[PDB]
Amino acid sequence: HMTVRTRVTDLLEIEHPILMGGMAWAGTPTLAAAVSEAGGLGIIGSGAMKPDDLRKAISELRQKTDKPFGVNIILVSPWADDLVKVCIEEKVPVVTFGAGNPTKYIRELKENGTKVIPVVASDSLARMVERAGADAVIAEGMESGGHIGEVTTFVLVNKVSRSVNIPVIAAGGIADGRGMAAAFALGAEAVQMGTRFVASVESDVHPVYKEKIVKASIRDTVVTGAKLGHPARVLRTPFARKIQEMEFENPMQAEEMLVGSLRRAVVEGDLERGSFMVGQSAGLIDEIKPVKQIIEDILKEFKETVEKLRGYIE
Amino acid sequence: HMTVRTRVTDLLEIEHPILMGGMAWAGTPTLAAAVSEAGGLGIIGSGAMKPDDLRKAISELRQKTDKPFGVNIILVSPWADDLVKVCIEEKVPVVTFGAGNPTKYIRELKENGTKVIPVVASDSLARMVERAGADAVIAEGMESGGHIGEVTTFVLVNKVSRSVNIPVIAAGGIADGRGMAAAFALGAEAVQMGTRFVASVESDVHPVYKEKIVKASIRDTVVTGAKLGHPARVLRTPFARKIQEMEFENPMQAEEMLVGSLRRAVVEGDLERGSFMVGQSAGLIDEIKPVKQIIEDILKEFKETVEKLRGYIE
């Protein structure tokens, strides 16, 4: 089939330049294993985990697949240090980081053979982690679901690719091969998707979450928590709208009702109380397919898109 | 040189698939004339104009160039009707519209031989204006400077392209050939730039405006007026930050100091009191060049980008 070789496929020793996004609750071992088996890089989201949970998670994944995989670590977690140690001890091939500067850990992880891929939303952070020894970076645009920065993918991927020599991985707004083509045009050498993979048959999120992604238009997301210092892109529900109003009228009250809301969405499909992290890519997703098919479709459309672009330079 | 033919170049009868954005104050006859002369489509921004002004502007532009050009009309202007009649009377080749649904005017303009290209930020509006007889549409992502919608370029251009058969022109985040390549991969057949052309030697905006575009990073913009119903992306100045904090603390006071602010920026370079419409593309712009060179650079890099993409499907 149409397989694309990039510096990221070489670096990670995987078949396809497609990574799964680090997601708390949704980023389970079953989903990660599926993406890794399909030839991409599955990622376990440790966001919501204690060290024993992560270790149980890594073990479950390995009972499902021999292929490479990664773990996402949220730096603002109070278990961050211990989670990094679990990864070194379990010899996890790739480790990605969110919510901060992971310079602190790069050297130890690297000396143990781990590939380190920070998630960044600024040209600055990209440069710093490159100097600190990062193997690659994930430039995540604000159209992405979950916690977001302030720069769109179109601009960010461009700027970051120009600024660093290490490969850049595009994240935010990519749900098909047109998107991969575009990401690559901007300078990326791999893509990362979250929403698209939650919208898979292997994803074990609650059905209502899948239903909402499918039925969502490109305009059915809103940003909550901007005023609380942790802006997040979520499905536009009447609850999301109340949180928005609330974070001005009573910030404490808003912080309160966000507590446990990510889990209520992912595990309980609770529309009246949950936070459904969803990128704007939701509006480019109309069905639920198996992970293997999603990848094949993206690679096929990528080849087609590059071919029609060839048409203009004749 | 490397010139690219698209349905948009045929439709508009111009050499290059590059349009200048409609901008109040910045979108002057001189800059439009320069873009049209360079082979793209210059656009006069009627935003801040009375019918007599538009007529004088059309005349000036014609004393500068024989090539095709357009006029941007803001629907929420009280002179909208009269502005449309000026365009019909002066046989303006292309008319673009912003800030609403221009269905009302499409048939009259079309019967007079004018090409109508609405600016949209939603898939819905795109479909409607297509059914109403629009020749093309401009999908404007929220990374764009000035008044913005809520969907990023990466996602919007993809969805709109898929939904309508008429050509789509990508706007927002495009300041180079990588961008044009990416835009085209997403489905567009032309691009529109604002910031990039304000950052030209022919642009007659105040020098401080140009200096700021050049010195601005991809993160130096903020959105003011979200709560006032007219969200606009501006340079992140202390004044912009005050207006933000103020539209919640005292909405009517905010509305008051925004009055006359766009002109104070463009004409007087007033940093303490002006609103500098600026896309996130500002951070991808590091110098001021002539319009003719911007276009050549974009076309050269577009060719190079497509060729590099060819490398992956080998």
UniProtKB/TrEMBL annotation, chains A, B:
| Chain positions recorded as FMN binding sites | G22, A24, E140, G145, G173, Q192, G194, T195, S281
Keyword entries, A-Z: Flavoprotein, FMN, Nucleotide-binding, Oxidoreductase
Q: What is its EC number?
A: 1.3.1.9
A UniProt-annotated Pfam family: NMO
**What enzyme category does the UniProt record give?**
oxidoreductase
Q: Please provide, alphabetically and separated by semicolons, the GO molecular function terms listed in this UniProt record.
A: enoyl-[acyl-carrier-protein] reductase (NADH) activity; nitronate monooxygenase activity; nucleotide binding; oxidoreductase activity
* Entry-linked Gene3D superfamilies: Aldolase class I (3.20.20.70)
Q: Would the keyword Disulfide bond be found if you checked this record's keyword annotation? A: no
Superkingdom classification of source: Bacteria
Protein name from the UniProt record: Enoyl-[acyl-carrier-protein] reductase [FMN]
